[PDB]
Design an enzyme around this catalytic site. Structure first.
Site, PDB file in Angstrom:
ATOM      1  N   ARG A  71       0.822  -1.199   0.000  1.00 22.05           N
ATOM      2  CA  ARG A  71       0.000   0.000   0.000  1.00 22.05           C
ATOM      3  C   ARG A  71       0.861   1.255   0.000  1.00 22.05           C
ATOM      4  N   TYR A 108     -10.423 -13.081  12.131  1.00 25.03           N
ATOM      5  CA  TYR A 108      -9.222 -13.637  11.517  1.00 25.03           C
ATOM      6  C   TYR A 108      -9.376 -15.154  11.336  1.00 25.03           C
ATOM      7  CZ  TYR A 108      -4.074 -14.108  10.721  1.00 25.03           C
ATOM      8  OH  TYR A 108      -2.820 -14.330  10.179  1.00 25.03           O
ATOM      9  N   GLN A 120      -0.483 -30.185  19.276  1.00 27.43           N
ATOM     10  CA  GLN A 120      -0.903 -30.455  20.648  1.00 27.43           C
ATOM     11  C   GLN A 120      -2.275 -29.848  20.887  1.00 27.43           C
ATOM     12  OE1 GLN A 120       2.244 -28.576  23.039  1.00 27.43           O
ATOM     13  NE2 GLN A 120       1.498 -26.516  22.536  1.00 27.43           N
TER      14      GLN A 120
END
Ligand SMILES: [Mg+2]
Ligand SMILES: [Mg+2]
Lengths: 250, 250, 250, 250
Positions: free
Chosen positions: C37, C154, C250
């Site tokens: 950008r 997200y 895990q």
């Protein structure tokens, strides 16, 4: 040389997938010991890649626990400290869980599971804490991911290898052993074994099986193994690497 | 009664998880045979749930292949055709792959893996093609999903159970056997075994382990098994059911 | 040179992970266009890797659909047919699903999801049927695999990228487009963004987070992308590649 | 009554899967509000299950953020505090990623993703810390697990729902909100929508698609939702529940 200074043991290394892995490993500068049950095949296999300065055959049955300790001593005596164990030795039985005899159940797990366990366990004991960028590569399968109705015991073995390696990887990580552990999951790969099974590749090449419409070649598995054997993958452990032409993506 | 007419064998059914599964199964109208290694524990376990019209104890070691056949004959003689097999018997060893002796390796796999194989295989042979809404429920674990650095052989076993069951489900599905096969993946469950391990529940209750901040109770596993044993789940097969307080979600 | 003749577009290529990917791509003989950008950051980013014969900066916001078309035309005009698209541009918001504003929700998905969609779709349209060993590499995350309670939107984005790419790979496979599609799932990677977040690396380095006890470096993600961009990975499509120091094991 | 005292909102509840979920929820003693875009269909849908003492229709578009807050107020005003949100509303587009228009890309994600986000976010804010045994059930899909070459945008949406719910579940767990979040992954389910698509069920019933050889019925999804809505599943959060006749097991 992406495998400069590496010393690898490739079980089942005299044919098919393990053969190519051995081939590409030497190509990338690693020293290699390949194991198999037949001396004539094995010797010719080793010679086809290079001389005894870079590769040697050692007769070993991967289910032979005692032999594993010998295999390590011989390799180290030849090339120095082992940095890379590729547990690639494996057999398949074409039986449903229903139709699986116990003799078949135990024979297959003896190579596929116990063999991967022996090589993982011994590899950790011998390669830890020596700053070798050590790497254990356990050959699972797409059959470690999804079921096949005629590969019951094989599924059990490849699913067992998948999660056990994670156990191994976590331990090595947490204890700063400098040993990574990972699994490679070949889809259908054209080998002389498949070429012996009439109509098998044709079955495996169907779009409902392998989206790409063909099966792979041993070098496809070889290159992912090189990546995992090299320090390029120093941050990868406990992970599964799928090379299956899209088989498991649908 | 969600399990009306169902006839179940619950291995390891004398304690903890298998006990509650047995308890809730009878509650939903199923007839149940529970197996265990000790008669004193087992008989009292059966009596605590009901009389011999709905539940019976049978001494059986799940690694006992020949015994499995006797177990099926006794159950059917007692209650009629078996509709539900819960492969729940299992042992745990607290060892890393590195520190795992071969005796531990083989002892654990004999119960955890061979036992689930014996019960799945026999269960398919015995329950297929009888229109029973038959259901095989194989007790895996969160340890079938992720690794634990101190549960090497257990991870191997639970991973083997996860993918083998998928093999089984496909065969049964493809052959119209009317037998579903699924896996249950308990997270940490408060059992007498855990209460015997000093500080264990406290370790398992840490948010980095179990997000909910506590471990489960046997009835938590009991209710998912009921779902899987009943015809409410007639369209579910080859799938994994996770009840772990969020353990595997992070 | 493992990427000989390859022509790549690396979005978000001016910093962190995309920067190293660009760096290693050129190292392996690929020609690369990086997007960002800011022109001052971008131009200097390009110059730090090489001259305009091998790498160019292009100002582009990955959420800019029309710009994507300009980006392809400029790259092909500069370097010839594009063979490799790396959808790496992405932003993160530190909010729970509960605390997520709709503006944050939409801002993040516009870059992280729409951008990966724009680049995948255009990439397929532009690279198919030209025998280029074409490769789409979509940057997902460990957050495409498991949840994080403070990364709601997200997680949504990275999970969307994981399974959409699979959609893409199948289509390309089934239609013989000669375009593979795969996802890379970085764990915690030391970047200028992380070094700006006080105490972040320390949190990510905890064994309960990253088993290895440290976070990765941009070259760790760079090397797996090279593998996926080269013809060494011609049989891999629709698969996920995890490099996370064991985070998800895990 | 397994849902005694529960108060649920089922979006897309006027037809197919959501209709059955609503049906079985009332059957288990829950009060239910179903949403849809058409008043005539919706009203008749509600009436087909029971009177206004147990179920009501509310016109609501799941992508309508402002409407969500209203929907909650109306439901609570009718039946009291909401305990159960079933985000079931969803649309599908039959397009490859390549062939997906942006209008289609955004329309589908508007219902499938934004709608699930709005209901999850609002559900957490309204149901937390009231001891309701609160449950958010987000309708993902088998398409949240594997790709489909002609369901590009759908795959993105269902993959997004899968991992976002995990984010939500972890947060609620860690903060003791008494809210679980889980995903249900229907395979192919016979609905009037499928019956409108010529040859679709026949395609979906092929053994290479659904191992069982037939597709499911809306009640198959209904029963898994009941389980997840009830306190029987009090230890299950952040998990995926697959009911697909074996589709994803191979
Ligand atoms: Mg995890
Ligand atoms: Mg599949």
């Amino acid at each position: 040389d992406r495998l400069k200074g590496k010393v690898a043991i490739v079980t089942g290394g005299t044919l098919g997938i393990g053969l190519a892995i051995a081939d590409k490993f030497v190509e990338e500068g690693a020293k290699v010991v390949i194991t198999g049950r037949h001396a004539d095949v094995g010797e010719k296999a080793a010679k086809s890649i290079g001389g005894t300065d870079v590769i040697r055959f050692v007769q070993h049955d991967a289910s032979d626990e005692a032999g594993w300790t010998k295999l390590f001593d011989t390799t180290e005596e030849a090339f120095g400290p082992v940095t890379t164990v590729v547990n690639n030795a494996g057999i398949a039985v074409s039986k449903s869980v229903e139709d699986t005899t116990t003799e078949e159940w135990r024979k297959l797990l003896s190579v596929n599971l116990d063999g991967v366990f022996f090589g993982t366990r011994l590899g950790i004991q011998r390669m830890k804490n020596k700053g070798l960028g050590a790497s254990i590569i356990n050959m699972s399968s797409i059959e470690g991911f999804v079921g096949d109705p005629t590969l019951g015991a094989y599924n059990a073995s490849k699913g067992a290898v998948r999660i056990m390696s994670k156990s191994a990887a976590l331990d090595c990580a947490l204890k700063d052993y400098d040993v990574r552990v990972n699994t490679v999951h070949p889809g259908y790969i054209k080998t002389p074994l498949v070429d012996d099974l009439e109509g098998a590749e044709e079955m495996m090449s169907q779009r409902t099986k392998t989206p790409m419409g063909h099966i792979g070649e041993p070098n496809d598995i070889a290159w992912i193994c090189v990546y995992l054997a090299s320090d390029e993958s120093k941050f990868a452990t406990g992970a599964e690497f799928v090379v299956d032409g899209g088989y498991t993506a649908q």
